[PDB]
Design a protein around this ligand. Sequence first.
Ligand SMILES: [Ca+2]
Ligand SMILES: [Ca+2]
Ligand SMILES: [Ca+2]
Ligand SMILES: [Ca+2]
Ligand SMILES: [Mg+2]
Ligand SMILES: [Mg+2]
Ligand SMILES: [Se]
Ligand SMILES: [Se]
Lengths: 522, 522, 477, 477
Amino acid sequence: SQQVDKIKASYPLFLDQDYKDMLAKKRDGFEEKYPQDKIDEVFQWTTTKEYQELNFQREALTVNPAKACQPLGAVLCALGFEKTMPYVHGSQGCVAYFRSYFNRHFREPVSCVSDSMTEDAAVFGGQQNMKDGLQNCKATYKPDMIAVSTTCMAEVIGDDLNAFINNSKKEGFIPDEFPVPFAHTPSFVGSHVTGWDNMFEGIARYFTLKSMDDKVVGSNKKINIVPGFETYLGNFRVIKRMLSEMGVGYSLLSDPEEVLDTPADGQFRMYAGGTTQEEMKDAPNALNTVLLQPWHLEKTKKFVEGTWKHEVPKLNIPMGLDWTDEFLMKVSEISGQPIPASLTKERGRLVDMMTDSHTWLHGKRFALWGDPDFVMGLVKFLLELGCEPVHILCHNGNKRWKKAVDAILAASPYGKNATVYIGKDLWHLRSLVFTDKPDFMIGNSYGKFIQRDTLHKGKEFEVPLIRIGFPIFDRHHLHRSTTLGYEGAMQILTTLVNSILERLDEETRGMQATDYNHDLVR
Amino acid sequence: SQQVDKIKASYPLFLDQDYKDMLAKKRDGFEEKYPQDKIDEVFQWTTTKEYQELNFQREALTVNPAKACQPLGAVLCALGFEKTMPYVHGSQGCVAYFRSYFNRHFREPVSCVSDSMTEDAAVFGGQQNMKDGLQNCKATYKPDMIAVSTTCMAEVIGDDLNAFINNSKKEGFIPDEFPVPFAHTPSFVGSHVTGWDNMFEGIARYFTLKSMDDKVVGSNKKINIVPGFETYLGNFRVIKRMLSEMGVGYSLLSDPEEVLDTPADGQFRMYAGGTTQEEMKDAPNALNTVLLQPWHLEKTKKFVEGTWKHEVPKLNIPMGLDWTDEFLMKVSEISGQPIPASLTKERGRLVDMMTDSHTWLHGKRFALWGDPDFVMGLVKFLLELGCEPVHILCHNGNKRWKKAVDAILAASPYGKNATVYIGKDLWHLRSLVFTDKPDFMIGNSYGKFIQRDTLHKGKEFEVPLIRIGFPIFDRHHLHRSTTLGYEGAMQILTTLVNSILERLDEETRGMQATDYNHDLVR
Amino acid sequence: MSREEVESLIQEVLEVYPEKARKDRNKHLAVNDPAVTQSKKCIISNKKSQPGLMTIRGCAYAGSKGVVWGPIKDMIHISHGPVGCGQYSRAGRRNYYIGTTGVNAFVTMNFTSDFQEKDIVFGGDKKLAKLIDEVETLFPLNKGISVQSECPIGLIGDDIESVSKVKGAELSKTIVPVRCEGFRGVSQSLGHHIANDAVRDWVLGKRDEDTTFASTPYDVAIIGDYNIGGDAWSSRILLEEMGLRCVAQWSGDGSISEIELTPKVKLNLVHCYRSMNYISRHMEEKYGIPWMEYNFFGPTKTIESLRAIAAKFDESIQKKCEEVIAKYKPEWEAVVAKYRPRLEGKRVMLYIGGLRPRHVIGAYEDLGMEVVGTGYEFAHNDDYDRTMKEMGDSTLLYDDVTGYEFEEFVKRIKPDLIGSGIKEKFIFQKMGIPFREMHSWDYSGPYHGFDGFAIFARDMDMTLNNPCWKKLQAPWE
Amino acid sequence: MSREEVESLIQEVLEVYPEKARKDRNKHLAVNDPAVTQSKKCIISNKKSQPGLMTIRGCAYAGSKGVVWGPIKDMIHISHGPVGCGQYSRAGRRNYYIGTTGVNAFVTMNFTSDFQEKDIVFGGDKKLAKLIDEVETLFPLNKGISVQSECPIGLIGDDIESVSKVKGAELSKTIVPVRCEGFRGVSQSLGHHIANDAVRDWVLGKRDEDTTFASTPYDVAIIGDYNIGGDAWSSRILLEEMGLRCVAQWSGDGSISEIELTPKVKLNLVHCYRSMNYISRHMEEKYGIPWMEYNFFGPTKTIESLRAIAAKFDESIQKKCEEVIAKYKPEWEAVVAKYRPRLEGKRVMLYIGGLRPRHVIGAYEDLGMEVVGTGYEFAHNDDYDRTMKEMGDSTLLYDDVTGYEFEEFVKRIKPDLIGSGIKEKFIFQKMGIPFREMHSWDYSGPYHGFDGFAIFARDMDMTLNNPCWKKLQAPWE
Ligand SMILES: [Ca+2]
Ligand SMILES: [Ca+2]
Ligand SMILES: [Ca+2]
Ligand SMILES: [Ca+2]
Ligand SMILES: [Mg+2]
Ligand SMILES: [Mg+2]
Ligand SMILES: [Se]
Ligand SMILES: [Se]
């Protein structure tokens, strides 16, 4: 039933007695459900060290992964170029998923096309799909560039993108000089970040390989910046802001911040902003190229060093205090521009916040996951705050990366109780947060189900989630945040300390029981 | 007892059995405590409509006020001027409290002196305190200006600040040319915001009343901005940022954002930034003067209209969409500067966020409190979001203000279930949130005790606090936030919607009970 | 808009396309004529999408794993192949259930074989067998496994049927191989068909020789309700208040046992025709169980459906039917009285999958709203046959609409509200057109039944009439 | 730093002041000589603050309402006068209690008469009488009322004692008038004395003729522990493990009944001498109850205190005393073993109110730390007498230190840690000097007793050794 002046949605409608009784009758009559006592027994067992040991012996099964597939990353890379349509050669079902995934995280339109290969293409490949797909996309959506990646069907049947694109031009489906950079993006290699690297390197090669004989390193007096796979708008913005404050000439190569944040003013804008073709053609003339997320830009790095002859600096992601300092000092060295008063002051305001909040952060224990560079930067900043990363999970991490993070842990007493995990998923992480319970998790929205699980064991076992990463689908507008630079560090600190104080207030809100410690001032 | 590798502070130390047993023995032996059943009975009674009616019949007793006293406001005003020492003539106990109150909200040093009048001054008045106080302050702390206000002792005994300061200069305690603007700030009239108005008007008079003959309205091509009592650093910053983006010449009169946000770089800076004496002297040459918080700037407004002959525009606080639009359109009219593309886009990004989040905001019911201008702006923006501001409390509000808010409520269908209260306190508000329960409270840290009280009645009666206002003492760094302009509206929207979704996740986290609605995507 | 005006709009929009695409798309766009009963005279459907045009369609894996199988709550569904498909489709669809997730129910979890290069090169059948053993170890209360094939599985020649048979026999467990690779078919549609045949072949006949279940004359199954936001629960309540016994729900909040008991029912009640007509026909062929289409969107359709269903039984159920209708009359009348004056005359355009573009029209009409355009991602002509009499004369119909087409139609038609999916939502909001998600219900619902209609009305009103829509134009422009 | 160097630091700092202030401030700064027993030969204290110099002191209302009376949990304390004083002091001091706030306990609430102009002009005694009736209506379980006078009350000639007597008689209620207006005295100190005299005059004698309390030979009261962060509870536990019965705690977690039972005890144990010596002397004069000072900061002092207390009783208590000491030995030894190597040799400067600037020195020394400067806001010379023996030779002592002085002293001495209040905290942090709040315990504690020492040690270590302090200098400067 409903009362018209206080209409109930699913929650709490289905808690009405009539629905409760109906659902009990369904269960008893027809579901042949395991008895509650057995459900409870199995749940308890899934919280044990014995269960964790079995869980960590998995070789074949993956449960609740913390990564996605290459083409997702190619699409994000492509979106950062002016008037560029991402185009995924292969199966359309993929593109429905890539768009929806980004739509949910950014709450924005996400434009991407497929060339709709079907089973018929297994006989003689997707060449005709490419010809008609390129012609149709160009006519209909009027991009100035089409950036082509692949789905796993196209990879398995072995379609040669280069030949197919060349033949599309040869036969007049798309103009000879219309830019169609490409990259092979197999979903069964690496992850979404690998797809970003592949795509970027494809675009860089397209605009520069054949024109290198007129290029001179340093002649344009700029620094190139390659952001990698980045889903916080504040991260593109803060890098641009800091370089502008320093008076450093720069080119941000792949810059989707405008197309992922168009105004609602009565018109839909399929394209906005982005890196220009002129910028990509002129990029080898920069002083140097800085990679913001080097642990997924290894192919890009090889191209930039081997072909552009840039001496790419060995810089960590600019997260936290030390690595933001290192980034600014390196940029200063390359550009000859001093670090200005404004950034020195910003840095000291972060340090002030650290001094103000240190007593509540000290010794706090975190489980955390994400992509390699984000995770390493978060670990570094947590050590700087006097926190203990204890469970560090990077599903798409590698051995070299893990050694690097193990080195960072060794340079700090706050690293002593920490373990780095690669190739492990959120069902592994679930075991760790039961067997070696931390104070909080820092992760994406998939973390909510771990929090749910921990609460079921008991309130004293609950591990609250702090949402930092990708995707975040169950909160609004967190994609506007920042994690890089001093501004990102100030935002992360604020979120952490207030998460700690919010939990403390929950724990001390019980009248005459725990409210002796429900302090007004903290 | 303690275990050295997991030391317990008060929470949860005193939940150990031995402390629990000890505390039970103290109670039963010596406290002569009312029986728990009677405590429960009385608690329940305090949640009733019968109790509410008695509560609202109070004429003499105030409980849990939502205001402070005048000199607190004078001190904040004074801090906004370059190298200025706030000086409160009267009793030193006051200054210890003003400094500590601001110290806790800003997590910064707060410099303020007293001239330490004692009981002896009741015979003879505080003239000698003023002479030595001014001399001593100037010598020790080397301010370029001392801005004098009063404590209630000095007001009751009737000390004439003007005569006392004049005598200080006559007798050589401080140079004749040294600026010593003053204001009478009786704690038993109005509130802290009144003290801000009094102080500002006193400073404005000091620098302009005797020098009006050479002034010409509009000759410096600037707009003066008077912010009023403002405790979010982001509010001073956003106004400056918007006017600079528009290419509008401006003077922000009282600007404490630098002195309330010095870096931690190895030195203490007693003074930083602030409005210059030159700006105050030149202020009558502006085109006009805009008051950001007009409902506590009435005395200032009379001076600016009557003496500077500025035609102060009738503008509401620039909060929410419509009032930010009105502010920018008025500034455009006064200055002749068009509203730039950057602000148009920012506005459209706010509207985008509104469209994105409207389904979760719609119909949500709020209790809220604060100072008059902040509260009216919050009401307005809540109506713009399709929310219902049902309990609107402004302890320090007046009848004219209440009429203005009642008119705002009448211009919206979302105002239909709303009531405005003036002269009522947080013990009044506590009753309202029991008898006519809203979804959330928007208020300062004193609201945490109301949330505690509501939870004690039961989880289904708990009204969570959303912290927006002053003071906020139990979270860190929220004073860096913004509530004005499009930026502030974006921040408020995000806080509100995410507070709604956090609570919904809490209510749906129960495994096999309510987690049918524990959605990944919201 | 007149017929001539709409025809003109179609031609103008098609002008942008190259010739091959223009000629194809013309066949998928029509001006409705409710007189016409054979939609194959006025629109083509269930064909391949044109490359490069930004179809909104998904794939057969979405139709099998995401739609039919994934909701079955006490089985573990393996996304078999590389990591992407399972991750993007993890908990995206609000097919609600009651259970203890990770213990006896598994719907919002993502189980995957996470194929790497070695699995593409040498095959994944050994990995799948090892995976099955790991599932059994770590999830002992699972009541069966399905294997949802992603694109590579058939392309590399893996034999998941062999693995399913051998492992299923070894563990005495139902293990269902589903050949729903995204390269098959043209859309979600063929995934439904594949999935229905897999239920038929591997699950539905398990109890064919079992006589232990005590049947009653009033036993029904709800076929093709995926319990979006609880829709199947708000349907079930009414059927049971009318005196029927709902033995099974396919597949929202569904259990494997309920599926296995379905051949014992007296009548199959089909909500989603498109996804479950296949198995409904099978059950009539094999078990002699009749099926009928119904509609629980809005009071007019819900009342018509309750009466039509009750007419299949005896006088005792017809009497309870009228009791149910009398009980809810004041509730839905109150909803109409409150919301119809707020929505009367407003015009809506829909674009959804295979059922809702026609099924929700009555509920709009119950609030005085007009559906001026509608269309489907993957419907067949039998769906369009059912649509043309539900839609007004001279309205616009679109099959597998391109992004470009939908935007241009909306610009001309200027509907007051659009009801479509997540890939459409943010486009139309930026244009200043109120938008409701008509797949996910915008995280609201249920919308089925009487209790759902109250929420539907609330929702259309809160969005169409929201104060935000008056604010898109800056007052200085 | 040598005596000569410190003497020259004092003279250098005093150079900034006008002559009158210079001559005054010189008398309030001293270089310690632990050979001196009469501090009136080397420092002046408990004098007026010099105008304009940014004293850290508060007022008599802070000493009465904020310190002595406000903690008493089952009474309602009225801040009588304008709104400011009660608001700034609301829940600023962590005097912890067990109760149901708003119902039987009222500590963190702000009750005020919110004086307006009409109350200043015509007086507030009619308002106070009406206020008392409103309190009784709305807070029926209160067990008494105090009236904490703010500045205006005495200045305008109100007669709160008459109101208290008349209303107290009418309502059969303890209503205590406290003339703690901020204009009285020079600091918090006189508010203590006023408050003690008010307890004496209006509360403490209530049970003088009552013989019903079942006294024992082991009855004590804790006098002058305001239970900051639970400090009195971590003290109480040890006294009761030693076989004593703690009849009362003045005033942290204190009840009016415990105060009224205090004249029945055998021994008053005084922690805070400065604030409660007055009533301790009164109780010895009137009731013959002896009192003794003790110190529960750190293991050395706590063990010394337990032994000295037990020595006042019999062999059974002396035996339990050694049992307590043996129990906790491994616990505090483990704290020392962990933290002393992390803090050994570090230098500390303190500035606090009336007790802690000397009382905590032993705890620091138990961690190998040295207190190189200390001082008080409002201590008298009897406090300095007790300090000079606890501080090292040639250390710096400061009475009612000015903000300028404290900064300049810190710049020269370069302590490793500073322990002071909220108005000092953020200054010293910007200077790169680790800072611990030694009033509020930085929202930590307890610090008293064995359990408190573990938390103290953890806290001093977490701050002094924190990684933030290495980060103040930008690597490009
Ligand atoms: Ca958006
Ligand atoms: Ca600070
Ligand atoms: Ca949007
Ligand atoms: Ca010992
Ligand atoms: Mg904590
Ligand atoms: Mg414990
Ligand atoms: Se579907
Ligand atoms: Se004190």
